[PDB]
Amino acid sequence: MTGREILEKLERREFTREVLKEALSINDRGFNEALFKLADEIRRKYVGDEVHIRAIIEFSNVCRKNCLYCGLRRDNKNLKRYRMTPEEIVERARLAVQFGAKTIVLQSGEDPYXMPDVISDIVKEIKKMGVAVTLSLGEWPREYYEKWKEAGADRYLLRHETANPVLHRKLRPDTSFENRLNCLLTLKELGYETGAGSMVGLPGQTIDDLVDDLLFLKEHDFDMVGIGPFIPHPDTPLANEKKGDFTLTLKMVALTRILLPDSNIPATTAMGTIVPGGREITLRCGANVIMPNWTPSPYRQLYQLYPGKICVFEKDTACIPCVMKMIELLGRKPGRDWGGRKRVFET
Ligand SMILES: Nc1ncnc2c1ncn2[C@@H]1O[C@H](CSCC[C@H](N)C(=O)O)[C@@H](O)[C@H]1O
Ligand code: SF4
Ligand SMILES: [Cl-]
Numbered sequence: 001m002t003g004r005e006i007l008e009k010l011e012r013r014e015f016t017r018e019v020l021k022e023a024l025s026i027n028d029r030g031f032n033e034a035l036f037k038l039a040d041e042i043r044r045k046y047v048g049d050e051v052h053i054r055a056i057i058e059f060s061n062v063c064r065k066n067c068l069y070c071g072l073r074r075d076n077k078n079l080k081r082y083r084m085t086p087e088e089i090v091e092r093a094r095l096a097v098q099f100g101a102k103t104i105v106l107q108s109g110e111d112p113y114x115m116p117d118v119i120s121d122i123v124k125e126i127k128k129m130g131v132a133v134t135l136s137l138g139e140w141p142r143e144y145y146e147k148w149k150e151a152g153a154d155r156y157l158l159r160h161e162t163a164n165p166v167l168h169r170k171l172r173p174d175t176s177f178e179n180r181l182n183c184l185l186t187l188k189e190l191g192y193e194t195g196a197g198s199m200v201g202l203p204g205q206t207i208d209d210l211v212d213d214l215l216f217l218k219e220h221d222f223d224m225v226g227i228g229p230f231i232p233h234p235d236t237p238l239a240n241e242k243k244g245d246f247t248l249t250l251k252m253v254a255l256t257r258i259l260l261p262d263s264n265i266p267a268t269t270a271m272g273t274i275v276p277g278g279r280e281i282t283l284r285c286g287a288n289v290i291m292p293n294w295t296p297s298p299y300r301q302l303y304q305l306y307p308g309k310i311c312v313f314e315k316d317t318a319c320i321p322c323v324m325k326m327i328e329l330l331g332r333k334p335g336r337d338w339g340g341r342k343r344v345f346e347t
């Protein structure tokens with residue numbers, strides 16, 4: 001259909017595969033700008049002008065898995081590995097809460113050392129501070145997820161990466177889409193606010209695959225959706241592949257907001273890495289969350305999922321203040337509470 005008719009169907013919520021495919025395939029500037037405006041307006045209406053700050057501590061870059069896209073993959077010998085101590089992680093979290101963070105995100109490689117009991121201990125200590133805790137630790141047994149929920153964790157981020165099971169298995173050779181989905185379903189059953197999401201522009205990924213990602217997210221009605229471009233890392237098998245396209249990734253964020261109007265959607269660091277000011281653009285095209293880096297030196301520079309990451313040369317405490325300034329210059333407001341999903345039940 002024409003751009004105008006696709007927009008009209010999106011506005012009427014005729015979210016057919018055909019409508020989504022055409023939205024992603026049309027490259028017209030006028031169409032794209034209208035799509036972004038629609039997503040921005042839906043964001044404003046459903047989740048308001050508050051931008052929720054989640055302070056992320058990347059506490060270990062040790063990983064047992066070998067994902068082909070990721071700089072932390074176990075086969076990468078050209079990376080200094082680190083582990084923050086439990087005391088360092090708790091005190092770093094406390095500093096974030098002192099700086100006004102209402103959610104602490106603990107993220108790592110799949111590092112066996114902490115699992116499950118050290119994480120449980122850390123979660124309990126951080127929960128005493130009266131903030132939300134979000135974990136992003138990869139795939140672990142149900143029993144671990146259960147222990148972490150009992151310890152007080154509120155949310156879990158586990159991007160589905162790609163909903164194409166063949167592509168998923170090739171890129172993530174230790175595991176599968178079936179396992180990734182079962183993990184996400186387990187997290188939901190246990191009562192976590194659950195986050196999924198995907199990379200855009202993976203080698204071999206098609207527009208139809210992106211449509212499938214959108215339909216998968218809509219199907220499962222995730223609380224959070226993290227989306228960013230694939231960024232090749234020189235010490236991985238995908239070193240020589242093309243980076244994901246910023247505008248296409250932005251369209252995926254916009255469509256995610258249109259499909260899941262009451263969800264929490266970050267403006268990811270990868271978006272700010274491939275285009276200067278990319279996070280700010282993304283916050284104006286459907287996103288309502290930002291995750292300032294709170295990993296301390298000397299470790300911040302060693303958590304290299306992809307190269308060139310912004311935030312690496314700034315001081316340990318710079319990023320929360322940075323995003324507060326950002327929020328103000330965008331004409332937005334910081335989140336007032338923990339920024340949990342506020343469902344708007346509809347038809
Ligand atoms: N090269 C790369 N380019 C863009 N994003 C990447 C990337 N490598 C990894 N990521 C993204 O970073 C996210 C965090 S990975 C860290 C958490 C955990 N090990 C897990 O795998 O879930 C991933 O879900 C993935 O989407
Ligand atoms: S994406 Fe997560 S599980 Fe895969 S190699 Fe990177 S850190 Fe390890
Ligand atoms: Cl979160």
Ligand SMILES: [Cl-]
Pocket residue numbers: 157225226227266268
């Ligand atoms: Cl994310």
Ligand SMILES: [Cl-]
Pocket residue numbers: 228268269270271
């Ligand atoms: Cl990212």
Ligand SMILES: [S]
Pocket residue numbers: 293310311312314318319320322
């Ligand atoms: S930062």
